[PDB]
Design a protein around this ligand. Structure first.
Ligand code: KR4
Ligand code: MG
Ligand code: ZN
Length: 339
C-alpha cells in the first residue's frame, strides 16, 4: 500500500519540487536513505564504483541516524533535499557530460553529509558559548569541519565503507573534493564564493550546444562548490508550498537558539527572538541580498537552464512581500554571510 505510494513520489526525483516531506512521512522518516538509494540507482553509481547495495544502505541508515530528529531545520529532511537538488542541478544541460563519475559521486556524497550531526545552533553561538566543538576546531568553520569528520568517520562502521572498491587514488581525489565542497557550505564564505563565481562567469567558454568548457581542476571544483551552495540555499526557488514549510522550520530553529541565549542571560542573536520577530520582511531581505544575487549569477553561468528558477524566486519574493504586516536583517546578513 504505502510502498506503492512512495515509489510514485520518487518518480519525481529528477524534478525541482519533489515532495520531500511526503517522502519523509512515507519512508518511516528515512528520506535521506530512500532518496540517496534512488539517485545512486538512477545514475548507475553502484555498478560504476562497485558498491555493494547492502553496504550502501547500511551507510545511509547510520548517516541518517546521525542527523538529529529534534532539530527543526538542520535534519535528515534538509539533507535529503540538498542531495536531490544537487542531483537535479548536476543534470542541467549546460553541464551535460562535463563531470566525471567521481566528481558526481563527490558532490552527491558531500551533499548527503554536509550538515550531519548539526546541533541546531550556529557556529557563532558555538564560539560564544565556548563549546567543545569550537575548541576542537579553533573557531574556524566549526560545524563544517565536524560534518566532514563525522561523515567520513561513519565509513568505518561495520559494512559501511561504500568506497572500499575505489582505487587509493580515486579515494584521495574524492576526499579532497568533498572536503573542498563541504567547507564551502560555511555560510561566512558566501560573499567570496559568489564574487569568485562572478569573475569566472565573465571569462567563460561554452560549446556550440551551450555547454560549459572547464579545463582544469580549479574551475571544476569551484563550479561544484557553488552548485552545492546553491542547493543549500535553494529553498526560495522551490514551489511556494515547500518554501513556506522550510521557512517555518528555520525560524523555529533560530527561536530555539534564541530561547537558549535568553535562559542563559546572553544577548539574543539577530533573527532569533520570537518576541521581536519579523518573518516576512526577513525573507524578502534574504532574497534581495543573498539568494537572488546568488541565483542570478548561477543563471548566467548555465544560461538559459535556470530561467524558471529565477521566475519562481521572483514570484516567491512577491508572496512574502505581500504578507509583511502594514537592522536585525542587516545585522544577521553581516554576521552570517561575510568572512
Ligand atoms: C527558509 C529558508 C532560509 N534558509 C536559510 N538558510 C540558512 C541561512 C543561514 C544559516 C546559518 C545559521 O545556522 C543556515 C541556513 N536562511 C534563511 C533566512 C531566514 C531569515 C533571515 C535570513 Cl537573511 C535568512 N531562510
Ligand atoms: Mg551547513
Ligand atoms: Zn545545509
Amino acid at each position: 500500500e504505502q510502498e506503492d505510494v512512495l515509489a510514485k513520489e520518487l518518480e519525481d526525483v529528477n524534478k525541482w519540487g519533489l515532495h520531500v516531506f511526503r517522502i519523509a512521512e512515507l519512508s518511516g522518516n528515512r528520506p535521506l536513505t530512500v532518496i540517496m538509494h534512488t539517485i545512486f540507482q538512477e545514475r548507475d553509481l553502484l555498478k560504476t564504483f562497485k558498491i555493494p547495495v547492502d553496504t550502501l544502505i547500511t551507510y545511509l541508515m547510520t548517516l541518517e541516524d546521525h542527523y538529529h530528529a529534534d532539530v527543526a531545520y538542520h535534519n535528515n529532511i534538509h539533507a535529503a533535499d540538498v542531495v536531490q537538488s544537487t542531483h537535479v542541478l548536476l543534470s542541467t544541460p549546460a553541464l551535460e557530460a562535463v563531470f566525471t563519475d567521481l566528481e558526481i559521486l563527490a558532490a552527491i556524497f558531500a551533499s548527503a553529509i554536509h550538515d550531519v550531526d548539526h546541533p541546531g545552533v550556529s557556529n557563532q553561538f558555538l564560539i560564544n558559548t565556548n563549546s567543545e566543538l569550537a575548541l576542537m576546531y579553533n573557531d574556524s568553520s566549526v560545524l563544517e569541519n565536524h560534518h566532514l569528520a563525522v561523515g567520513f568517520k561513519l565509513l568505518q562502521e561495520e559494512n559501511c565503507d561504500i568506497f572500499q572498491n575505489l582505487t587509493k587514488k580515486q579515494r584521495q581525489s574524492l576526499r579532497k573534493m568533498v572536503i573542498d565542497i563541504v567547507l564551502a557550505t560555511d555560510m561566512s564564505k558566501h560573499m567570496n564564493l559568489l564574487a569568485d563565481l562572478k569573475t569566472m562567469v565573465e571569462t567563460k567558454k561554452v560549446t556550440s550546444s551551450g555547454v560549459l568548457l572547464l579545463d582544469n581542476y580549479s574551475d571544476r571544483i569551484q563550479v561544484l562548490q557553488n552548485m552545492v551552495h546553491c542547493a543549500d540555499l535553494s529553498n526560495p526557488t522551490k514551489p511556494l508550498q515547500l518554501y513556506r514549510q522550510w521557512t517555518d522550520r528555520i525560524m523555529e530553529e533560530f527561536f530555539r537558539q534564541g530561547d537558549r541565549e535568553r535562559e542563559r542571560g546572553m544577548e539574543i542573536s539577530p533573527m532569533c527572538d520570537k518576541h521581536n520577530a519579523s518573518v516576512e520582511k526577513s525573507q524578502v531581505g534574504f532574497i534581495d541580498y543573498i539568494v537572488h544575487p546568488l541565483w542570478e549569477t548561477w543563471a548566467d553561468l548555465v544560461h538559459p537552464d535556470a530561467q524558471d528558477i529565477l521566475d519562481t524566486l521572483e514570484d516567491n519574493r512577491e508572496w512574502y512581500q505581500s504578507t509583511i504586516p502594514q537592522n536585525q536583517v542587516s545585522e544577521f546578513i553581516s554576521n552570517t554571510f561575510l568572512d
